[PDB]
Enzyme design. Structure first.
Site: not given
Ligand SMILES: Nc1nc2c(ncn2[C@@H]2O[C@H](COP(=O)(O)OP(=O)(O)OP(=O)(O)O)[C@@H](O)[C@H]2O)c(=O)[nH]1
Ligand SMILES: CN(c1ccc(C(N)=O)nn1)C1CCC1
Ligand SMILES: Nc1ncnc2c1ncn2[C@@H]1O[C@H](COP(=O)(O)OP(=O)(O)CP(=O)(O)O)[C@@H](O)[C@H]1O
Ligand SMILES: Nc1nc2c(ncn2[C@@H]2O[C@H](COP(=O)(O)OP(=O)(O)O)[C@@H](O)[C@H]2O)c(=O)[nH]1
Ligand SMILES: [Ca+2]
Ligand SMILES: [Ca+2]
Ligand SMILES: [Ca+2]
Ligand SMILES: [Mg+2]
Ligand SMILES: [Mg+2]
Ligand SMILES: [Mg+2]
Lengths: 54, 425, 438, 352
Positions: C10, C179, C183, C254
């Site tokens: 991810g 965003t 989650e 360990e």
């Molecule tokens: N600490 C930290 N958290 C991250 C980072 N990138 C994303 N997150 C956290 O990961 C969560 C979202 O998961 P993602 O890693 O973005 O999603 P994904 O694993 O790529 O899976 P998809 O839904 O398919 O995009 C959010 O709560 C983010 O705050 C990062 O670079 N560092």
């Molecule tokens: C506020 N925001 C959104 C959220 C939903 C939608 C939608 N078109 O449903 N568009 N923008 C962005 C923060 C990262 C997404």
């Protein structure tokens, strides 16, 4: 307050300090859960198409 | 590469869609001939999301213009940016829909639907990875309503796992072309409930009340109403067309906004909305207090009459992101009686560095609120006022429809009202 | 010597993976092109750094990593970044559209069609190991891929590598840098199907990294780059014993022995200090006693909670820099007399201590300042159960109305897998209370 | 506009605070399950501390110190005093106490009989009292057999502590009493003592030759208003306040309430709270805490103050609900959420 197992090398050292003494699913079953979720998808999408055919 | 396929159907659909492409084209530095002339690389970062890169560095929008009469689309082609559109993506009939949902959906439209989908298919086959579709249209007319929904019904059949978004103009008796608009609107809404993932509701009355009251326009025009839709469409697409830590496609954006399959009707908002005292800089507090004010909402629905399921806010311009959080967190912690408490953190925020044309900074509002039920109540009330007497039904029964299909659309939307009601308590 | 394969799943796992290997290279003196002037065995050798790096005939030291993402936009930053030369194209696997923050998507729909490929790519690094220890898995709880795909990868790794260990580095979801709204579902879904497959898991709460960046680094609004450079420091300190000479935490096994007496309670709490702003004029260098005394403050825990109202099962102190055992024991004594450190009666009240003389390496131009000594405390406390309680509460709020449930059902998941995953957490929370409260 | 919630409808104290908060027009109340709040008036038992301080942009404050139960539970207090070096086992202001577990379940049974036999052999007064937190259930007896036999008849932990056979008796009447002092502790751990106390007095003549009738020995407000026949005779509601009690001390004994009892009370409150500060302090925590306490004291005929117990959720005196509640909003709430004297408290300075 005792220091046991003192190990020292060139890049550091590690020890232990005691203050007080004390008092899976097989490869066959995973393919099934995956293929089973794929079947419920095909059945839900078929009901979507049957609906559109009507 | 996550491409979008745009479609505009009918008069309202194509006029609004045209201005839309006029607004974002200017933002990405695309002149009326398809040539790029901007100054920032951010203009090209996500340029392939709405534009197809042709030869000679020419950019051709990925849109499909549709209508049953040649009038409107002849205007687009001769319009400001009309040359930019692909010549083939113009698909039109000659009979017209006569503001009759039945004609657009069953008779006239049916004869032309196959040829429109042939173009849709041709645009998809080139997409490296299609995000989904977006249709602009009205629901009170006959083409964008009757045929538009028919298109969606057939696009979902060929692409059952792609996102279907729509910008739908809802009819109001204060801005009415024909007394049958509630008929066409009620019939379309049931299709949207079934075969759309997200639908931005845009009430012509709220657009009219905004141009008259907030904007101080003595006699508003359809063109004036379309400038708002233009700017609003540009706002909701900002997170899609520009880069940033957002990294969100249509599906992920819906996943965080639609807690239930059928309650996917949003109310959008825009700010500022100033009358020509137009050069004043707008602070982050003012941007937020207006963004949530009903007079800046385009559904003509009082949000304080319902509850927010999810809210999305996009901020454009060079501002203090720390200051954006504070004010947004302030609006929540000062009106938490209007957000649902069974969805934690249902208010999110995005920032974008590039502001719209001619504005230091702006804010776009996207609200999935139960207050929208008041919209479908008006439509259902106006529908029943006529259907109880079978008035004007002959225009439809003559096209092959039965009174039964009307009774079902009636009961279908009343269900949609009841569904929005059990989640407000 | 025995090898360790790292896996990044991810966006969160892949970006944090980028920030760690950047650090590993600076620590081990590895240049961006992969060359190591200090390595005198050209294209071979069983040194400590070789647990994470392999060597080629040309003298290139290549990570033992595998980056997996269902959409290519995040992994592409690695293919063209500063350290593009370290990895080869095999190690970077990318799909075309992600999981839209949908566990059911990353696990079932999309995961089934790419799982056999990841295994093969990992099998290619396994065949290069003369004695593979196990895997380090970096992923997020929220991400549809980080959560949905990781749990599936774990189930298969326990089938293709039964006797191997699997540690996690999991990103707890915090609303300040997210965003999404679903989650809590993913976090609770993945912790359910992964629990019996992970021997030891380090949870980082973005909310914790966020406030450490705002408070100690004076960043008004920290970016993921900020969060990752700090998180890669803690990760470095936790994986240092595997990459340098030493006798404490010398192999993945360990970690469980020293930190996880009960299996289902395999979530150590991490604590780090000091974190000093580089932009500062010039800070007073903290002593061993001062930085250790800071390990018991909530303000530098990777998960905000109150260890005073829990019970410790195990405790490790990993020091880096100018530290001698004499100074460590001095601070510990003074802290037991001022703090509330309640252990469980079925575990010794002790501390294993590791000291690496090389002080923490800092990425030039980064946000952290160069300190002469730093420490990281790994402590298994029943207080971390607060993190689960928080998360489990948000899950209940939404699931009571079946909100967003259709998105998971529509991707092939059964509604029952929710309540099945939730009841497992209700059991995990009970195990923490049976071991902590009186 | 600050926001708060209510999760303990049975709290007569904070029911008034909420009423005053809404009177300011600057505090809005929310439903009892809305996490977006500035202030929480939480429940008594099983308060979910772990979920506090995780809402972006919100500084959250709660009215219960996590871990204060160590000081407000019967058995917990005794174990705290005998195990805490700050108080030691030789603590001179706390009655010799012992924790006793029923035989149907550490336990200080043998240690208790040791001191018991030492007293029975030395002709000293050997009248003990058994009590617990699961009571409204108290037994006073001079025989060790009756005390132990009464605890085994129950099923929760109990405590046997020395009974003050030489209590101070008010005149006229020859009656017992106890003293209640309210102590507030704000987020900064400043220890404020309410200048106003109350004495819950017994309306019956103290009788040392008959512990069977527990009406002249127990000074609880509910036992005097139910099993006493002289209720309200000498003072309204068996409640004498610091003004009259100060005049009596000057007329009969030739001393002041400040010099005879208040110093010891201010010393006990300090020793107890400073002791557990490093365990309950919210100085560097992600949320803030402040709690109201109710110390119950005893006084013997030598004017020595003893500590009976501490209440974590005490009620107030009807005449002092207004002045005290307002004070809570001044020093505890507004000090963290300022609004747009002659403090009624007495700051007990200390070393943090
Ligand atoms: N600490 C930290 N958290 C991250 C980072 N990138 C994303 N997150 C956290 O990961 C969560 C979202 O998961 P993602 O890693 O973005 O999603 P994904 O694993 O790529 O899976 P998809 O839904 O398919 O995009 C959010 O709560 C983010 O705050 C990062 O670079 N560092
Ligand atoms: C506020 N925001 C959104 C959220 C939903 C939608 C939608 N078109 O449903 N568009 N923008 C962005 C923060 C990262 C997404
Ligand atoms: N060791 C002792 N010597 C003399 N009297 C005692 C005593 N222990 C308790 N008492 C009497 O019992 C009363 C206090 O009882 P206790 O506090 O144990 O029960 P309780 O906690 O339910 C009453 P509250 O909580 O309202 O103060 C006092 O009025 C006191 O007179
Ligand atoms: N906002 C806006 N609404 C329009 C416009 N043109 C038509 N409408 C509305 O759409 C409805 C008529 O539909 P119409 O566009 O004629 O549908 P068509 O038959 O498919 O072209 C009426 O309610 C009009 O108010 C326009 O340019 N802007
Ligand atoms: Ca025809
Ligand atoms: Ca080598
Ligand atoms: Ca295993
Ligand atoms: Mg028209
Ligand atoms: Mg992703
Ligand atoms: Mg009590």
């Amino acid at each position: 307050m005792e220091v046991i197992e003192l190990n020292k090398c060139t890049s550091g050292q590690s020890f232990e300090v005691i203050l007080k003494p004390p008092s899976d699913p097989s490869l066959e079953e995973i393919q099934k859960k995956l293929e089973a979720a794929e079947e419920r998808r095909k059945y839900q999408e078929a009901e979507l198409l049957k609906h559109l055919a009507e | 590469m996550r491409e979008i396929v745009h479609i505009q159907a009918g008069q309202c659909g194509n006029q609004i869609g045209a201005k839309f492409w006029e607004v974002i084209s200017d933002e990405h530095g695309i002149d009326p001939t398809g040539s790029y002339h901007g100054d920032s690389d951010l203009q090209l970062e996500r340029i392939n999301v709405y534009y197809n890169e042709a030869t000679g560095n020419k950019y051709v929008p990925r849109a499909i213009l549709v209508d049953l009469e040649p009038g409107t689309m002849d205007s687009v082609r001769s319009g400001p940016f009309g040359q930019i559109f692909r010549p083939d993506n113009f698909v039109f009939g000659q009979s017209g829909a006569g503001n009759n949902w039945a004609k657009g959906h069953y008779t006239e439209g049916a004869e032309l639907v196959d040829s429109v989908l042939d173009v849709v298919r041709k645009e998809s086959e080139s997409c490296d990875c299609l995000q989904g579709f977006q249709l602009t249209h009205s629901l009170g007319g006959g083409t964008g309503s009757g045929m538009g929904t028919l298109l969606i019904s057939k696009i979902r059949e060929e692409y059952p796992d792609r996102i279907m978004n729509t910008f739908s103009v809802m009819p109001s008796p204060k801005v009415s072309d024909t007394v049958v608009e509630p008929y066409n609107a009620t019939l379309s809404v049931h299709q949207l409930v079934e075969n759309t993932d997200e639908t931005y509701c845009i009430d012509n009355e709220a657009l009219y009340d905004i141009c008259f009251r907030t904007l101080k326009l003595t006699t508003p025009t359809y063109g004036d109403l379309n400038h708002l839709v233009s700017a609003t469409m540009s706002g909701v697409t900002t997170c899609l067309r520009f880069p940033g830590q957002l990294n969100a496609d249509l599906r992920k954006l819906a996943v965080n906004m639609v807690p239930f399959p059928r309650l996917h009707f949003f109310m959008p908002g825009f700010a500022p909305l100033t009358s020509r005292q137009q050069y004043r800089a707008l602070t982050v507090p003012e941007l937020t207090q207006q963004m949530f004010d009903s007079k800046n909402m385009m559904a003509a629905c009082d949000p304080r009459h319902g509850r927010y399921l999810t809210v999305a806010a996009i901020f454009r311009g060079r501002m203090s992101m720390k200051e954006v959080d504070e004010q947004m967190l302030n609006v929540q912690n000062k009106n938490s009686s209007y957000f649902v408490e069974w969805i934690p953190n249902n208010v999110k925020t995005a920032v974008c560095d590039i502001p719209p044309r001619g504005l230091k900074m702006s804010a776009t509002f996207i609200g999935n609120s139960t207050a929208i039920q008041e919209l479908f109540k008006r439509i259902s009330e106006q529908f029943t006022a006529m259907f109880r007497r079978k008035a004007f039904l002959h225009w439809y029964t003559g096209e092959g429809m039965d009174e039964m299909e009307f009774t079902e659309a009636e009961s279908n939307m009343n269900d949609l009202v009841s569904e929005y009601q059990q989640y407000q308590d | 010597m025995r090898e360790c394969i790292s896996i990044h799943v991810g966006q969160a796992g892949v970006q944090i993976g980028n920030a760690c290997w950047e650090l590993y290279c600076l620590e081990h003196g590895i240049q961006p092109d992969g060359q190591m002037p200090s390595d005198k065995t050209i294209g071979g050798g069983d040194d400590s750094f070789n647990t994470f790096f392999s060597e080629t005939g040309a003298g290139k030291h290549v990570p033992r990593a595998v980056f997996v993402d269902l959409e290519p936009t995040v992994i592409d930053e690695v293919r063209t970044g500063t350290y593009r030369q370290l990895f080869h194209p095999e190690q970077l696997i990318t799909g075309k559209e992600d999981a839209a923050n949908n566990y059911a998507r990353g696990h079932y729909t999309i995961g089934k069609e790419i799982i056999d490929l990841v295994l093969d790519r990992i099998r290619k690094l396994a065949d290069q190991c003369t004695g593979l220890q196990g895997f380090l898995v970096f992923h997020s709880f929220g991400g549809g891929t980080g959560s949905g795909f990781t749990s599936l990868l774990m189930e298969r790794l326990s089938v293709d590598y039964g006797k191997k260990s699997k540690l996690e580095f999991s990103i707890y979801p915090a609303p300040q840098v997210s965003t999404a709204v679903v989650e809590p579902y993913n976090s609770i879904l993945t912790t359910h199907t992964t629990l019996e497959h992970s021997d030891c898991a380090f949870m980082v709460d973005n909310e914790a990294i966020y406030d450490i960046c705002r408070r100690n680094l004076d960043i008004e609004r920290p970016t993921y780059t900020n969060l990752n450079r700090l998180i890669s420091q803690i990760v470095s300190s936790i994986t240092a014993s595997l990459r340098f000479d030493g006798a404490l935490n010398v192999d993945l096994t360990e970690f469980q022995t020293n930190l996880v007496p009960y299996p289902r309670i395999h979530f150590p709490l991490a604590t780090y200090a000091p974190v000093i702003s580089a932009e500062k004029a010039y800070h007073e260098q903290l002593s061993v006693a001062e930085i250790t005394n800071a390990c018991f403050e909530p303000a530098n825990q990777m998960v905000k909670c109150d260890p005073r109202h829990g019970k410790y099962m195990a405790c490790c102190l990993l020091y880096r820099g100018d530290v001698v055992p004499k100074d460590v024991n001095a601070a510990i004594a003074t802290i037991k007399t001022k703090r509330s450190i309640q252990f469980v009666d079925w575990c010794p009240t002790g501390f294993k201590v590791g000291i690496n003389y090389q002080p923490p390496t800092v990425v030039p131009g980064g946000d952290l300042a160069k300190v002469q000594r730093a420490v990281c405390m790994l402590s298994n406390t029943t207080a971390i159960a607060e993190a689960w309680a928080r998360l489990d509460h948000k899950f209940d709020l939404m699931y009571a109305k079946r909100a967003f449930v259709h998105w998971y059902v529509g991707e092939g998941m059964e509604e029952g897998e929710f309540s099945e995953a939730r009841e497992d957490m209700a059991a995990l929370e009970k195990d923490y209370e049976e071991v902590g409260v009186d | 506009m600050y926001t708060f919630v209510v999760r303990d409808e049975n709290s007569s104290v904070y029911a008034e605070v909420s009423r005053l908060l809404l009177a300011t027009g600057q505090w809005k109340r929310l439903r009892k399950d809305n996490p977006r709040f500035n202030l929480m008036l939480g429940e008594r038992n099983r308060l979910p501390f772990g979920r506090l301080g995780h809402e972006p942009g919100l500084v959250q404050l709660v009215n219960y110190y996590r871990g204060a139960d160590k000081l407000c539970r019967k058995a917990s207090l005794v174990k705290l005093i005998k195990t805490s070096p700050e108080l030691s086992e030789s603590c001179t202001w706390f009655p010799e106490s012992y924790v006793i577990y029923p035989t149907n379940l550490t336990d200080e049974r043998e240690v208790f009989l040791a001191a018991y036999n030492r007293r029975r052999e030395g002709r000293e007064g050997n009248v003990w009292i058994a009590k617990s937190s699961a009571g409204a259930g108290i037994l006073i007896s001079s025989e060790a057999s009756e005390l132990l036999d009464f605890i085994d008849e129950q099923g929760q932990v109990h405590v046997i502590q020395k009974y003050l056979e030489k209590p101070l008796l008010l005149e006229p009447g020859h009656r017992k009493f106890d003293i209640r002092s309210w102590v507030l502790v704000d987020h900064l751990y400043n220890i404020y003592l309410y200048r106003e106390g109350v004495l819950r007095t017994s309306s019956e003549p103290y009788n040392s030759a008959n512990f069977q009738d527990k009406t002249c020995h127990l000074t609880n407000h509910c036992i005097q208003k139910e099993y006493s026949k002289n209720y309200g005779r000498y003072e309204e509601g068996n409640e004498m306040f610091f003004e009259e009690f100060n005049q009596y001390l000057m007329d009969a004994l030739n001393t002041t309430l400040e010099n005879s009892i208040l110093l010891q009370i201010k010393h006990i409150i300090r020793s107890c709270l400073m002791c557990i500060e490093p365990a309950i302090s919210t100085k560097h925590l992600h949320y803030q805490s402040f709690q109201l306490f109710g110390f119950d004291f005893m006084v013997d005929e030598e004017l020595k103050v003893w500590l009976i117990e501490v209440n974590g959720a005490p009620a107030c005196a009807q005449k002092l609900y207004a002045e005290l509640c307002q004070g809570i909003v001044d020093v505890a709430i507004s000090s963290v959420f300022p609004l747009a004297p002659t403090s009624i408290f007495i700051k007990l300075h200390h070393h943090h």
